[PDB]
């Protein structure tokens, strides 16, 4: 298992927006309490889950805890960059698993909830 994705960067700037703020306090919290959050609340432990070549196939591991700690650190550039990390998290799951499997069903239920929540987002 590689190190978890970065949460800070010295060469990268920091800002917050009313949208990012909505992503943390509303979107991320909504998903975080979803029934199916827990496989995604922390980086995938490919070792202990026995995922073959997980980190060869998945070149951008993403997870809601990395998202979370990024949002609290205002690591992100804008709401766009944060949504994309969410999108990466679901996509990673559809790339690595057979369509129809439990985990994919779970990512799909989180994604649909995610989608409805991102419509509540204002444009800055
Ligand atoms: O793409 C993934 C592939 C699967 N599998 C596990 C079972 N064989 C089929 C492939 O597992 C995950 C997880 C995950 C699942 C269960 C967890 C978990 C993470 O962490 C806490 C303990 O239970 C996040 S993505 C992802």
């Amino acid at each position: 298992n590689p190190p978890p994705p970065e949460t800070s960067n010295p060469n990268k700037p920091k800002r917050q927006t009313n949208q990012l703020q909505y992503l943390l306090r509303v979107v991320l919290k909504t998903l975080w309490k979803h029934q199916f959050a827990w496989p995604f609340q922390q980086p995938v432990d490919a070792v202990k889950l026995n995922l073959p070549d997980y980190y060869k196939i998945i070149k951008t591991p993403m997870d809601m805890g990395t998202i979370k700690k990024r949002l609290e650190n205002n690591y992100y550039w804008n709401a766009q960059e944060c949504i994309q990390d969410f999108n990466t998290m679901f996509t990673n799951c559809y790339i690595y698993n057979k369509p129809g499997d439990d985990i994919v069903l779970m990512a799909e239920a989180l994604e649909k909830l995610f989608l409805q929540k991102i419509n509540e987002l204002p444009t800055e």
Side-chain angles (χ1 to χ4, degrees), residues 37-46 49-52 54 58 62 89-90 92-97 101-104 106-107:
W38 90 90
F40 314 94
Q41 296 178 338
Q42 59 278 313
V44 172
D45 203 328
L49 296 162
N50 200 33
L51 310 181
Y54 183 77
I58 294 311
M62 200 32 71
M89 191 187 79
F90 314 125
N92 285 355
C93 179
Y94 313 138
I95 291 170
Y96 188 85
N97 304 275
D101 264 26
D102 291 350
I103 196 80
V104 163
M106 286 184 174

Side-chain angles (χ1 to χ4, degrees), residues 1 8 14 21 27 30 51 53 58 70 75 90 108 113:
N1 285 312
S8 147
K14 285 179 192 169
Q21 192 135 28
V27 176
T30 296
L51 310 181
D53 314 306
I58 294 311
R70 274 170 175 192
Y75 161 96
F90 314 125
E108 283 173 346
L113 181 39

Side-chain angles (χ1 to χ4, degrees), residues 106-121:
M106 286 184 174
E108 283 173 346
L110 266 183
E111 184 174 28
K112 152 176 232 185
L113 181 39
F114 168 86
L115 290 196
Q116 66 143 235
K117 299 270 93 171
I118 287 304
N119 309 117
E120 295 155 27
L121 189 87

Side-chain angles (χ1 to χ4, degrees), residues 11-64:
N11 323 131
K12 177 169 169 184
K14 285 179 192 169
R15 192 21 67 173
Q16 171 100 307
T17 71
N18 70 300
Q19 306 168 311
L20 287 155
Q21 192 135 28
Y22 195 78
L23 285 161
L24 186 48
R25 201 218 208 165
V26 178
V27 176
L28 195 279
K29 182 210 61 84
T30 296
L31 281 65
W32 192 271
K33 293 157 88 38
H34 192 280
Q35 173 79 209
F36 296 144
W38 90 90
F40 314 94
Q41 296 178 338
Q42 59 278 313
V44 172
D45 203 328
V47 180
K48 324 270 188 310
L49 296 162
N50 200 33
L51 310 181
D53 314 306
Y54 183 77
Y55 286 112
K56 295 183 207 62
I57 281 155
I58 294 311
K59 262 86 56 185
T60 326
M62 200 32 71
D63 59 281
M64 274 168 35

